[PDB]
Amino acid sequence: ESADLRALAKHLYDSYIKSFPLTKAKARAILTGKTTDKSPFVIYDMNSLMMGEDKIKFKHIKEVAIRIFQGCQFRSVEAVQEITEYAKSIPGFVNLDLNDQVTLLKYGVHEIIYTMLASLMNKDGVLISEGQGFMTREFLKSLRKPFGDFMEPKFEFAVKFNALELDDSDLAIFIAVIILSGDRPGLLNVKPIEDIQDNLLQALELQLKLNHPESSQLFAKLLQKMTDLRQIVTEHVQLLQVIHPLLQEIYKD
Amino acid sequence: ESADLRALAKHLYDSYIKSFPLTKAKARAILTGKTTDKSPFVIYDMNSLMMGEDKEVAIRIFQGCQFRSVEAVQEITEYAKSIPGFVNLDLNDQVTLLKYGVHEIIYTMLASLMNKDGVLISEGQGFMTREFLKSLRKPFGDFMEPKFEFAVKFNALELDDSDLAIFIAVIILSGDRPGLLNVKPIEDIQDNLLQALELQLKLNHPESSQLFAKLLQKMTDLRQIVTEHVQLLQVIKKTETDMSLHPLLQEIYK
Ligand SMILES: O=C(Nc1ccc(Oc2ncccn2)cc1C(=O)O)c1ccc(Cl)cc1Cl
């Protein structure tokens, strides 16, 4: 069957490219400065932040630590819609019961946000506003009582995750696997979900063998990173359990 | 290399048998009423508990289960030493691997002693119903339920002891443990255990698609039980100040 697996891999990669404007390949070029096109504007302290809001557009703009957290919310809501559009390209996804489609996205978007956030991170900071900015890890830590410990665990995961050296080709299938997980609560029909994931795990396995022939247990290592993601999502919602009515409706989650 | 991985699978299954007196194959023969094994006495209420026993009830049961974790930990420690490379790791790492790995292992193997209706006790001589455990006093009525919800799901994989042997080995040799000094040697070992396991699942479960994937995905549930379990011990400590914890169990819960 090792050809419709490579076809499912090529399909997914193509959607991923259409759905996510800033790809890892692209994000990598900006972060390593390997492409010396334009440097991102760097936010490394309070004065550069304030200058950054003058230069960079920012669609979400009172208080600084709050303002940064809300910007992250805006972007997260944006990510949710990119992921939802991608989920629809996954073969068989749209044929699932509508409630299950909603359930799979509801519990899955967070894990995928972190996965793709790792694509925009290094040990020193995170690319923001479509790669136009770069917010340092040290500037984020230097934030208030609850807010300075909000991005750190993402950076810690990213450093780990990024050491697998996956590319967009690999990430495209990996994200599809996350979405099609039949253990989400309240699913009504788990069978066709487990079926599609079985098919996606099979394509992810062959992809990793062909694309990373020298790292034998990369598949396993990647699967055990999925459990890492569930952990980070848990302690994050628990952090959102400390932190205008219409806006609080847009950001219900 | 295939032959090398098969040899490793054989080695670990062999040490598992020598280390764990109550195997899943034994537990299944007791639970499903075979003729290789005897039938357990069933504890389903305070009456059965009393006639079965051959300071309050919930505390007696909880402490009983606590003493069984101590035996498990001893068995687990004995089995780890047989995993090739484990005893050659830095001693501090050995302790860390055991400290964190042991609870995930206890709950994995405890699934072998469980069905949806209860769990085997006293080396399989007894069987305590899920409901008798679910009806215990306010904090102690909660302690077994996450393990049952896990067991029901974990058991649906239909793993046998030769699979579990390698999977337990993978659990112990995790380089994600807090405070590990040399992550690399641990990961090289795990890479090989993972290869062996992968081969084992393909060979032993040839009809069962992505069992390797599906089994590694079972770590999330293991982490959740552990987290919820240590939270419950914090509660027990504050409300039951006269109640004890075993030195070995003190060491681990940190
Ligand atoms: O953390 C994220 N984004 C931001 C967080 C804070 C922020 O806040 C901010 N920065 C500078 C000045 C004011 N506010 C802006 C963004 C962004 O992407 O633009 C983020 C969230 C999810 C995803 Cl998928 C990607 C990113 Cl880059």
Curated annotation (Swiss-Prot), chain B:
Residues binding rosiglitazone: Q66, F67, R68, S69, H103, H229, Y253
Renumbered residue ranges of the record's region Interaction with FAM120B: 1-46
Molecular function GO labels: alpha-actinin binding; arachidonate binding; chromatin binding; DNA binding; DNA binding domain binding; DNA-binding transcription activator activity, RNA polymerase II-specific; DNA-binding transcription factor activity; DNA-binding transcription factor activity, RNA polymerase II-specific
Location of cross-link Glycyl lysine isopeptide (Lys-Gly) (interchain with G-Cter in ubiquitin): K18
PTM entry text: Phosphorylated in basal conditions and dephosphorylated when treated with the ligand. May be dephosphorylated by PPP5C. Ubiquitinated by E3 ubiquitin-protein ligase complex containing FBXO9; leading to proteasomal degradation. Ubiquitinated at Lys-18 by TRIM55 leading to proteasomal degradation. Ubiquitinated by E3 ubiquitin-protein ligase STUB1/CHIP; leading to proteasomal degradation.
Domain NR LBD: 4-254
Tissue: Highest expression in adipose tissue. Lower in skeletal muscle, spleen, heart and liver. Also detectable in placenta, lung and ovary.
Effect on the protein of changing Q66P: In colon cancer; sporadic; somatic mutation; loss of ligand-binding
Transmembrane annotation, as ranges: none
Cellular component annotations (GO), alphabetically ordered: chromatin; cytosol; intracellular membrane-bounded organelle; nucleoplasm; nucleus; receptor complex; RNA polymerase II transcription regulator complex
Coiled coil: none
Keywords assigned by UniProt, alphabetized: Activator, Biological rhythms, Cytoplasm, Diabetes mellitus, Disease variant, DNA-binding, Glycoprotein, Isopeptide bond, Metal-binding, Nucleus, Obesity, Phosphoprotein, Receptor, Transcription, Transcription regulation, Ubl conjugation, Zinc, Zinc-finger
Mutagenesis / variant outcome for changing K18R: More than 50% loss of ubiquitination
Residue ranges of the motif 9aaTAD: 247-254
Biological processes, Gene Ontology terms: BMP signaling pathway; cell differentiation; cell fate commitment; cell maturation; cellular response to hypoxia; cellular response to insulin stimulus; cellular response to low-density lipoprotein particle stimulus; epithelial cell differentiation
Induction data: (Microbial infection) Expression increases when incubated with M.tuberculosis or its lipoprotein LpqH; induction is TLR2-dependent (at protein level).
Activity regulation comment: PDPK1 activates its transcriptional activity independently of its kinase activity.
Subcellular location: Nucleus; Cytoplasm
Job of this protein: Nuclear receptor that binds peroxisome proliferators such as hypolipidemic drugs and fatty acids. Once activated by a ligand, the nuclear receptor binds to DNA specific PPAR response elements (PPRE) and modulates the transcription of its target genes, such as acyl-CoA oxidase. It therefore controls the peroxisomal beta-oxidation pathway of fatty acids. Key regulator of adipocyte differentiation and glucose homeostasis. ARF6 acts as a key regulator of the tissue-specific adipocyte P2 (aP2) enhancer. (Microbial infection) Upon treatment with M.tuberculosis or its lipoprotein LpqH, phosphorylation of MAPK p38 and IL-6 production are modulated, probably via this protein.
Family the entry assigns: Belongs to the nuclear hormone receptor family. NR1 subfamily.
Reported disease: Defects in PPARG can lead to type 2 insulin-resistant diabetes and hyptertension. PPARG mutations may be associated with colon cancer.
Subunit comment: Interacts with FOXO1 (acetylated form). Heterodimer with other nuclear receptors, such as RXRA. The heterodimer with the retinoic acid receptor RXRA is called adipocyte-specific transcription factor ARF6. Interacts with NCOA6 coactivator, leading to a strong increase in transcription of target genes. Interacts with coactivator PPARBP, leading to a mild increase in transcription of target genes. Interacts with NOCA7 in a ligand-inducible manner. Interacts with NCOA1 and NCOA2 LXXLL motifs. Interacts with ASXL1, ASXL2, DNTTIP2, FAM120B, MAP2K1/MEK1, NR0B2, PDPK1, PRDM16, PRMT2 and TGFB1I1.
Free-text domain note: The 9aaTAD motif is a transactivation domain present in a large number of yeast and animal transcription factors.
Protein name (record): Peroxisome proliferator-activated receptor gamma
Portion of the full-length sequence here: 235 to 502 of 505
